[PDB]
Structure formats: structure tokens, C-alpha cells
């Protein structure tokens, strides 16, 4: 349940490449989304909400209007898990849908 | 205001072009959307809810998993007003993001 | 799976008491909910919708403004299964609060 | 329309009473809600968003599972306003109905 260097070098890149970044003094990833509006931003959130419920993996996130900041870290390992990688991956399918 | 004539024949066509049929035995239009899963289905529902609530024009919709059937008629008039029209397009636009 | 009549007899009464009720041409439960406004109705849909995805069990449902008619049945067995009951239980909870 | 000294006094009370605070640093009120789960949290977020959109007054909220932080300030007039108030009150009614 803990991203080992290997895992990381294989997994991180495709997200790193899109906007995801690792944080400091905490194993977790972040990314800032900026939609056109609230309709879209909430639409996006909802879709993410559904899946997080489905997987029992929740994001630390903040929104204001059309901006949505997401932060991913798994609780047990207290760092990244495969669980962050897919949610992100997922988040991504969803985002590019709106935008 | 119970769309008149030339308008129905200005406006509707565009809607029929895209699959909007006229309802049988009611002044209404209806269309059904097929999504891949419920996740998209509901995400689509939400964007619309937000819009509906915002204009105070609420559809009649029936959902099952990944299928959403929507009916548009203005209550005030008991028929096709401009409200339906605009809602339908916003709907169309939203449809595309998921679809 | 498809409930036996012994089962139907155990789980049903409580839902029956509450307003749930068997459909005539098929093996499913029906129940029409009414709320003050859309906010509440949509708000309620959203909570079952999360739950429904959590459990991979979806309802057939219809909504107009503040009214929501929910229909449950376990497709796989082609009739009431425990899923509909579980679900139904929860739908009940959510319901009671918005009222 | 940035609330008056008289204004604040006649309004903040109740909110004040409920847990809502005024921010040092900015003309804004704040509150952190705590729920039993994400379902409720999210259901909550939803009705609110519904309203937020209705009004055209969006919140600054953060969410990490079962807790939500809300900050309200009227960008328009650089501080608290009738709006934030209103919306705030509403946030409350909705919160109550979450159990």
C-alpha cells in the first residue's frame, strides 16, 4: 500500500505530465482544476463524489466557484497508494470531459 | 408563451434535427439520452438540476441506470414555451460533454 | 435471491407499513415521495445515488419538481431481491430527514 | 452593499449563536461542519450548491470526507453582505436535516 520508487517512476509520470505534483512534508499529490463555471465545476465534483464513494477513497478538496483544488493521499500508508493513482486517473477522465 | 407558429417552425426543427421528438397527446417535447454508466448519467442530471433550479424550469425525467429520459413542457401554459426551448439546448450542450 | 414467500413475509411488512407497495404487473416495489421543493428532492436523489453506486444497486425513478417516484426490483433475478430491501431501507432514512 | 455596523449587529447574532465566526483579516464569516459520513456531507454540499447557483453567490468550502468548512464574503462589495447572511442561514437549515 505504499508507493515504492519503482511504482512511482512508473505511475507518477502520466499524471505529473498533466499537472499533478507531489507535495512537501507529506506523500500526496495535488492538482488545480479551473473550469469555466460552477455548473461544470460541481458537475465534475459530483462525478468524482460518486466514484470516491464507490471506492471508499476520498479527496481533500476545496472549491470556489469554477476552481477546484484536489489533494490525494491514502490514510493508512500515510502517503500515496494505488488508490491515489486511479482516483487521479479517473479524475482526469472526468475533467477533460468538461473543459 | 405557448410557442406560436413560425417559432415552433424556427426552433423545433433544430431540436428535431438533434433527436427531440414531440410528445404524443401533450404539448411537449421529449428525448432520451443513453450514457455509458450511471456515473455519467447522474453527473449529467446534476448539471441540469443546477440549471433548472436557476431558471425555475424543471424537467420531467425518468432515469434508470445509464438512461435518462427527459420531457419538457411549461406548466404555466400547459405547453411549449420558450423555457422548454432554452432548457433543451442547455441540455444538448451538457449531453455532449458526457456523450 | 428472489425472495421466497417466507422472506417476502419477513422483510416486507415494515416497508409496507411505511408506504412501499408491490406492483401489479411485476415483482417490484413502488413508492412515491413528496417534498417541499426541488432542492430537497434533488438533494435526496443525490444521497441515494451515492448509495446506489456504493452498492451497485440502482432504482428506476422518476422526478418532477418536488415529487419522486422510486421503483425497486432486482433485475438479475427478475424480482425483489435483498438489494431492493436494503436499498429501500436507506431510501427511507434519507427521506425522513428531508421531511 | 457591504453590511453596516447596525446591520451586522442585528444579523450576526443567530449565526453567531450557531458557530459562525467573523474572520480577522477579512470581511468574512466562517464555519466548519461535521457530519457522520461523506454521504451526508455531500448531500449537504449539493442542496447548498443548488441554492448557491440559484442566487449567484458561491461559497468557499473545503471538504475532506465528513467535514466541510464554509467561508462567505461578497466579492462584489469586498466584505459581508445580506447575501452571505441569507445563504448562511440557509446553510443552517440544510445542516439540521443531516443525521
Curated annotation (Swiss-Prot), chains A, B, C, D:
One protein family per Pfam: Pterin_4a
EC number: 4.2.1.96
Superkingdom of the source species: Eukaryota
Annotated coiled-coil segments of the chain: none
Gene designation: Pcbd1
Source organism phylogeny: Eukaryota, Metazoa, Chordata, Craniata, Vertebrata
UniProt name for this protein: Pterin-4-alpha-carbinolamine dehydratase
Acetylation found in the keyword field: yes
Binding site for substrate: 56-58, 73-76
GO BP terms, alphabetized: L-phenylalanine metabolic process; positive regulation of DNA-templated transcription; regulation of protein binding; tetrahydrobiopterin biosynthetic process
GO cellular component, one term: cytoplasm
